[PDB]
Design a protein around this nucleic acid. Sequence first.
RNA 1: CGAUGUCGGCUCGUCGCAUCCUGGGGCUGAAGAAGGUCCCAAGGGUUGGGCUGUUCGCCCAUUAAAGCGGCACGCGAGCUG
RNA 2: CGCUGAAAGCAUCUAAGCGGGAAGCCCGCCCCAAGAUGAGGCCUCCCACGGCAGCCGGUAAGGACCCGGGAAGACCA
Lengths: 204, 140, 174, 16, 37
Amino acid sequence: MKGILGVKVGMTRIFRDDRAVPVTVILAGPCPVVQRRTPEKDGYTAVQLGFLPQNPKRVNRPLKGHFAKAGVEPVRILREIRDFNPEGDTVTVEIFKPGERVDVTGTSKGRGFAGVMKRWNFAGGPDSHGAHKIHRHPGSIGNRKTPGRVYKGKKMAGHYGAERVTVMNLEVVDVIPEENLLLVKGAVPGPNGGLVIVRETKKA
Amino acid sequence: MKTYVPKQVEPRWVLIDAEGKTLGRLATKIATLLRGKHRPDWTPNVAMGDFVVVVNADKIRVTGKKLEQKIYTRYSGYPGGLKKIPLEKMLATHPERVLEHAVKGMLPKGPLGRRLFKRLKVYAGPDHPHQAQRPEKLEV
Amino acid sequence: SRIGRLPIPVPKGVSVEVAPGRVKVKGPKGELEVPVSPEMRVVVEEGVVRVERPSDERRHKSLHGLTRTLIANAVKGVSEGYSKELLIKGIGYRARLVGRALELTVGFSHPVVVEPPEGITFEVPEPTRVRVSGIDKQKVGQVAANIRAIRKPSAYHEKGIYYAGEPVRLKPGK
Amino acid sequence: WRIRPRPPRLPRPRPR
Amino acid sequence: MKVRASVKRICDKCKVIRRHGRVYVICENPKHKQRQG
RNA sequence: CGAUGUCGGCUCGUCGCAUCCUGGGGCUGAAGAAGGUCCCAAGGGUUGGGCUGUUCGCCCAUUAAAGCGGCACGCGAGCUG
RNA sequence: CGCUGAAAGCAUCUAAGCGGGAAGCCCGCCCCAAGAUGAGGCCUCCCACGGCAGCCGGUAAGGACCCGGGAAGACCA
Ligand SMILES: [Mg+2]
Ligand SMILES: [Mg+2]
Ligand SMILES: [Mg+2]
Ligand SMILES: [Mg+2]
Ligand SMILES: [Mg+2]
Ligand SMILES: [Mg+2]
Ligand SMILES: [Mg+2]
Ligand SMILES: [Mg+2]
Ligand SMILES: [Mg+2]
Ligand SMILES: [Mg+2]
Ligand SMILES: [Mg+2]
Ligand SMILES: [Mg+2]
Ligand SMILES: [Mg+2]
Ligand SMILES: [Mg+2]
Ligand SMILES: [Mg+2]
Ligand SMILES: [Mg+2]
Ligand SMILES: [Mg+2]
Ligand SMILES: [Mg+2]
Ligand SMILES: [Mg+2]
Ligand SMILES: [Mg+2]
Ligand SMILES: [Mg+2]
Ligand SMILES: [Mg+2]
Ligand SMILES: [Mg+2]
Ligand SMILES: [Mg+2]
Ligand SMILES: [Mg+2]
Ligand SMILES: [Mg+2]
Ligand SMILES: [Mg+2]
Ligand SMILES: [Mg+2]
Ligand SMILES: [Mg+2]
Ligand SMILES: [Mg+2]
Ligand SMILES: [Mg+2]
Ligand SMILES: [Mg+2]
Ligand SMILES: [Mg+2]
Ligand SMILES: [Mg+2]
Ligand SMILES: [Mg+2]
Ligand SMILES: [Mg+2]
Ligand SMILES: [Mg+2]
Ligand SMILES: [Mg+2]
Ligand SMILES: [Mg+2]
Ligand SMILES: [Mg+2]
Ligand SMILES: [Mg+2]
Ligand SMILES: [Mg+2]
Ligand SMILES: [Mg+2]
Ligand SMILES: [Mg+2]
Ligand SMILES: [Mg+2]
Ligand SMILES: [Mg+2]
Ligand SMILES: [Mg+2]
Ligand SMILES: [Mg+2]
Ligand SMILES: [Mg+2]
Ligand SMILES: [Mg+2]
Ligand SMILES: [Mg+2]
Ligand SMILES: [Mg+2]
Ligand SMILES: [Mg+2]
Ligand SMILES: [Mg+2]
Ligand SMILES: [Mg+2]
Ligand SMILES: [Mg+2]
Ligand SMILES: [Mg+2]
Ligand SMILES: [Mg+2]
Ligand SMILES: [Mg+2]
Ligand SMILES: [Mg+2]
Ligand SMILES: [Mg+2]
Ligand SMILES: [Mg+2]
Ligand SMILES: [Mg+2]
Ligand SMILES: [Mg+2]
Ligand SMILES: [Mg+2]
Ligand SMILES: [Mg+2]
Ligand SMILES: [Mg+2]
Ligand SMILES: [Mg+2]
Ligand SMILES: [Mg+2]
Ligand SMILES: [Mg+2]
Ligand SMILES: [Mg+2]
Ligand SMILES: [Mg+2]
Ligand SMILES: [Mg+2]
Ligand SMILES: [Mg+2]
Ligand SMILES: [Mg+2]
Ligand SMILES: [Mg+2]
Ligand SMILES: [Mg+2]
Ligand SMILES: [Mg+2]
Ligand SMILES: [Mg+2]
Ligand SMILES: [Zn+2]
């Protein structure tokens, strides 16, 4: 179960066998192994990774001493891939090759305080026939005296997006090792320049 | 004269090998021990009892077909969040909770009550980490 | 009119030593073990093994014949063995042996391969007679039921996999 | 479903 | 299988048994097969 | 009765199962296909129209199916009227 | 629906035991989560500061205020 840290860069389409395949491009590589989680000391099995070189100025003291014990220069992000122990001490895009199949995890685009129609695909009220100031309003939220209360988890308006989202079974279309590029046919969570994670798929 | 109430006493650590004992009958004596009613100077409003260390709570035993028919339950607060898991499945995954749940419902409700629950330390398996207090082993 | 008392003929050389709740039975064709109720008593006589019951209430009466016929079948297993035959009926139907496995061609679209567990060994004389052999009576009896189940004897035609000596009862069709 | 139609117990509220 | 609160023997080959705490009527004639409920 | 706003619709659902469909079964006057009927099962699904305020009902065209009920005949400090 | 099997010399899926068997239950998938007060774990950083399990200060590593902002956002974060 292999993973890699990366940044979403932007979408395009290419042509493969006279078919148009819309891809998103992810600057994945390279990710230096900064720490290894072993059952003896930690309990599970995982690898702490690193992304984006950082100003050794910007990196504070306790962080600095951490990076150093591993031999890594300061890097902007630490994230762990679970159940992963690569042979080397640095991960590149070349742990995927075209035809594979990935799960991609990012932070979705935040829609802030979203209405009930945007957030929950509700249908609001009529826009004529006497409908009165309720065109985007949810409707009834409960019953009457029995139960006399509102179900926990009731779909109401509130913040939507800027949450973790994982998309599954995405075809690895091509890998550009030199420029550390990973191609993936489909839609990846989040904005361009957003941090993402690319693991091997859970599906089969 | 007024009834004697005691100054804060040093509590006693106590060990039980819960193996092969009946669930509710051991559960009832662990409650008495936690409440410290075995003590001549019992005072109702303070934790004065014992610390009860238990091992092999997984090897507890129970009569009837209760293994397949004793159903513990949890309510999440959400629609449909009543979950029902029988005894055997509990022992398979979280066996200390069986005896733990039993002692609990035989303890009082209120502050002191659930503070007495904290003075119980149930362990599955043959061993316990509490060698430091050196708990006196009781055959109950 | 009672089986718990009828003593168990033990041929030579069968080794029927006794343990608390176990009765080990080593024979010429292998060994088996018998879980015996701890309330019953197994006894070893000269070439005979006998079982006594501790009381005459229902459960001790029920356990009795059982923990006899159980120890019985284990003596007849390790010595002369247990078999069970399966006849196959149906025009296209046939079964063959692929090394130590059994491949049935019983009119599906695939063919079905059965894997004989530890103890069971398959054997196919004709292309329409399968034989299950093993020292365990219950285990032989499972495998045979297992295999037969794949294509149970139909109702309307003489098609399916049949138990040895299975009555061929059918029902009219039109 | 109540087969026999049920008459209102209250008037439609009017200003008093 | 017929399910009913009146399990009865139907023919002379019908047999009444109790398996898994329930009354049955097994028989070679498959119609005669019964359970109580 | 010093007020517990009352049909139907919209919206949001949630539960029961005496199950419409989907799943698993026994019996069949079950050849196959397809039905009948009883048992298990509430996980999910259960369309769009014409008429009438209508719930209901008929009808059109589909459907895997076009389930029945509880929630103050759920839901007027949410809307309609 | 069975295997083996007595009570009950036969039979019996069961009384001892072992199978097979649902979109259903438990895992498994995605998401939240140690306020899980039972408050967990690991990696790294500071470290014995001055005075009459407490107080008063100056500091350490750090943090915060303030500012430029941001597919983050009502304010807060
Ligand atoms: Mg763009
Ligand atoms: Mg190409
Ligand atoms: Mg992320
Ligand atoms: Mg965002
Ligand atoms: Mg926004
Ligand atoms: Mg949106
Ligand atoms: Mg939406
Ligand atoms: Mg929409
Ligand atoms: Mg709408
Ligand atoms: Mg609209
Ligand atoms: Mg609409
Ligand atoms: Mg108006
Ligand atoms: Mg308006
Ligand atoms: Mg309004
Ligand atoms: Mg509303
Ligand atoms: Mg209430
Ligand atoms: Mg937010
Ligand atoms: Mg999501
Ligand atoms: Mg695909
Ligand atoms: Mg006390
Ligand atoms: Mg006490
Ligand atoms: Mg009370
Ligand atoms: Mg007024
Ligand atoms: Mg039936
Ligand atoms: Mg009748
Ligand atoms: Mg019979
Ligand atoms: Mg009134
Ligand atoms: Mg009033
Ligand atoms: Mg009033
Ligand atoms: Mg009022
Ligand atoms: Mg009405
Ligand atoms: Mg039912
Ligand atoms: Mg079906
Ligand atoms: Mg059905
Ligand atoms: Mg016909
Ligand atoms: Mg048919
Ligand atoms: Mg049927
Ligand atoms: Mg359902
Ligand atoms: Mg319609
Ligand atoms: Mg018209
Ligand atoms: Mg209409
Ligand atoms: Mg109408
Ligand atoms: Mg009508
Ligand atoms: Mg159909
Ligand atoms: Mg139809
Ligand atoms: Mg209803
Ligand atoms: Mg409803
Ligand atoms: Mg009512
Ligand atoms: Mg009402
Ligand atoms: Mg109403
Ligand atoms: Mg309301
Ligand atoms: Mg209303
Ligand atoms: Mg109103
Ligand atoms: Mg209304
Ligand atoms: Mg109201
Ligand atoms: Mg009101
Ligand atoms: Mg009007
Ligand atoms: Mg008007
Ligand atoms: Mg039979
Ligand atoms: Mg027999
Ligand atoms: Mg039999
Ligand atoms: Mg049994
Ligand atoms: Mg089983
Ligand atoms: Mg079988
Ligand atoms: Mg199974
Ligand atoms: Mg499926
Ligand atoms: Mg998380
Ligand atoms: Mg914490
Ligand atoms: Mg946490
Ligand atoms: Mg708690
Ligand atoms: Mg506390
Ligand atoms: Mg604590
Ligand atoms: Mg602690
Ligand atoms: Mg912590
Ligand atoms: Mg831990
Ligand atoms: Mg802000
Ligand atoms: Mg701002
Ligand atoms: Mg402000
Ligand atoms: Mg501020
Ligand atoms: Zn009959």
